């Protein structure tokens, strides 16, 4: 179904800055319709680098899907400004992203929450798969907290829609988040749903470690060759062999030997219904 509204970028007033990556900055803004006097609070993700009419078209393509999501675990796109620079308009999310969240509630996050967040992120991703979207930038900094028991996956415009025949999306050059990408992605600039699984795996590591940096210290220049050896992100302290051994399956070289997002919703659910068996967190019942 078609819901995407394309809006005049002069209908938006930018107010405060909520963030800024390298792919663009996020504003706390204010949509003020034209010919109207009401002013409605939105959040505005604006992309830094201007975009080729191919980039524009692919975004526009991806955005008609994002403007129609049913899933509770994906942020629905509210609107978009295309003009010169592209701006994704989207609902305000006051609790912040999940990464910043775990970093300052580390002492109060228990196993039920961690495991439930994993189930939700997976659910959200599986939905996008069913919609033929390759998310291309899954990370914990791109997961938002609606409420601490309810996280949602969000897009900053780097998602791509697979043709009805396509299985891969080969990407041009640009700035990339290396420490979350599959290998095929770092070498061949190829992206599959299966690569999203790689990223999912890193995101989860991020959470189990309570907001640690992947490969902290190591420069992005090396990652590609470190992987080729067989080294991966280390097992988190709270993790049991059962949880880690899933993460690891996500960082398999042969992307056909990674778990599918639906297989992943199943394992993490059976775990989320007996959390103390799977994560060994200190003072776990006391939260």
183 plus 65 within the same structural domain? no
Query: Which residues belong to the active site?
Result: 137
84 plus 166 within the same structural domain? no
110 plus 99 within the same structural domain? yes
Q: From CA 128, how far away is CA 124, in angstroms rounded?
A: 7
Contact 46, 86 (CB under 8 A): yes
240 plus 107 within the same structural domain? yes
Q: Which domain holds residue 14?
A: 1-92
125 plus 1 within the same structural domain? no
248 plus 133 within the same structural domain? yes
Going by C-beta distance under 8 Å and a sequence separation of 6 or more, which residues neighbour residue 94? none
Q: What is the CATH number of the domain that holds 60?
A: 3.30.200.20
How many residues would you count in the chain? 287
83 plus 100 within the same structural domain? no
Going by C-beta distance under 8 Å and a sequence separation of 6 or more, which residues neighbour residue 282? none
Tokens of 115: 């495991």
Q: Experimental method for this entry? A: X-ray
Q: From CA 275, how far away is CA 280, in angstroms rounded?
A: 9
Q: What is the CATH number of the domain that holds 192?
A: 1.10.510.10
Domain boundary among 92, 112, 131: 92
The angstrom resolution of this structure is 3.3
Going by C-beta distance under 8 Å and a sequence separation of 6 or more, which residues neighbour residue 199? 135, 137, 138, 139, 180, 181, 182
> Positive or negative, the Cα torsion across 150, 267, 168, 204?
positive
Residue numbering of the annotated binding site for ATP = 18-26, 45, 90-91, 155
**C-alpha angle 222-217-236 in degrees, rounded to nearest 5:** 100
154 plus 54 within the same structural domain? no
Domain boundary among 50, 68, 92: 92
161 plus 217 within the same structural domain? yes
Q: Which residues pair with 30 in a beta bridge?
A: 13
Q: From CA 110, how far away is CA 79, in angstroms rounded?
A: 36
Going by C-beta distance under 8 Å and a sequence separation of 6 or more, which residues neighbour residue 152? 72, 73, 74, 75, 93, 120, 124, 143, 144, 146
Report the 10 Å Cβ neighbour count for 59: 23
5 plus 62 within the same structural domain? yes
Q: From CA 255, how far away is CA 109, in angstroms rounded?
A: 32
34 plus 110 within the same structural domain? no
Report the 10 Å Cβ neighbour count for 2: 6
Going by C-beta distance under 8 Å and a sequence separation of 6 or more, which residues neighbour residue 222? none
Return the C-alpha torsion angle 12, 13, 19, 21, nearest 10: 50
Going by C-beta distance under 8 Å and a sequence separation of 6 or more, which residues neighbour residue 173? 189
104 plus 37 within the same structural domain? no
**C-alpha angle 109-218-19 in degrees, rounded to nearest 5:** 55
Domain boundary among 92, 109, 132: 92
Q: What is the tally of structural domains in the chain?
A: 2
DSSP string of the chain, one letter each residue: -----B--TTSEEEEEEEEE-SSEEEEEEEE--TT----B--EEEEESS---HHHHHHHHHHHHHHTT---TTBPPEEEEE-SSS-EEEE---TT-BHHHHHHHSTTT--HHHHHHHHHHHHHHHHHHHHTTEE-S---GGGEEEEETTEEEE---S--EEPPSS-S-EE--S----GGGS-HHHHHH-EE-HHHHHHHHHHHHHHHHTTSPPTTTTS-HHHHHHHHHHT--PPPPTTB-HHHHHHHHHTT-SSGGGSPPHHHHHHHHHHHHTSGGGTB--TTGGG-
């Amino acid at each position: 179904q078609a819901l995407l509204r394309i809006l005049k970028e002069t209908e938006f007033k930018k107010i405060k800055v909520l963030g800024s990556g390298a792919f663009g900055t996020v504003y706390k803004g204010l949509w003020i319709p034209e010919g109207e006097k009401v002013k409605i609070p939105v959040a505005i993700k604006e992309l830094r680098e201007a975009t080729s009419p191919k980039a524009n078209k692919e975004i526009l393509d991806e955005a008609y899907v994002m403007a129609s999501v049913d899933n509770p675990h994906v942020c629905r796109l509210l609107g978009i400004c295309l003009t010169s620079t592209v701006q994704l308009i989207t609902q305000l999310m006051p609790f912040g992203c999940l990464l910043d969240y775990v970093r300052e509630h580390k002492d109060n996050i228990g196993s039920q929450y961690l495991l439930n967040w994993c189930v939700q992120i997976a659910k959200g991703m599986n939905y996008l798969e069913d919609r033929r979207l390759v998310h291309r930038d899954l990370a914990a900094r791109n997961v938002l907290v609606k409420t601490p028991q309810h996280v949602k996956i969000t897009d900053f415009g780097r998602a791509k829609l697979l043709g009805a025949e396509e299985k891969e999306y080969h990407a041009e050059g640009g700035k990339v988040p290396i420490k979350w990408m599959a290998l095929e992605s770092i070498l061949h600039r190829i992206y599959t749903h299966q690569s999203d699984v790689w990223s999912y795996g890193v995101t989860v590591w991020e959470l189990m470690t309570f907001g640690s940096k992947p490969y902290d210290g190591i420069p992005a220049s090396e990652i590609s060759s470190i992987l080729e050896k067989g080294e991966r992100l280390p097992q988190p302290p709270i993790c049991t062999i059962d949880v880690y051994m899933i993460m690891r399956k996500c960082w398999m070289i042969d992307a056909d030997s990674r778990p599918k997002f639906r297989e992943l919703i199943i394992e993490f659910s059976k775990m989320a219904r007996d959390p103390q068996r799977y994560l060994v967190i200190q003072g776990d019942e006391r939260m």
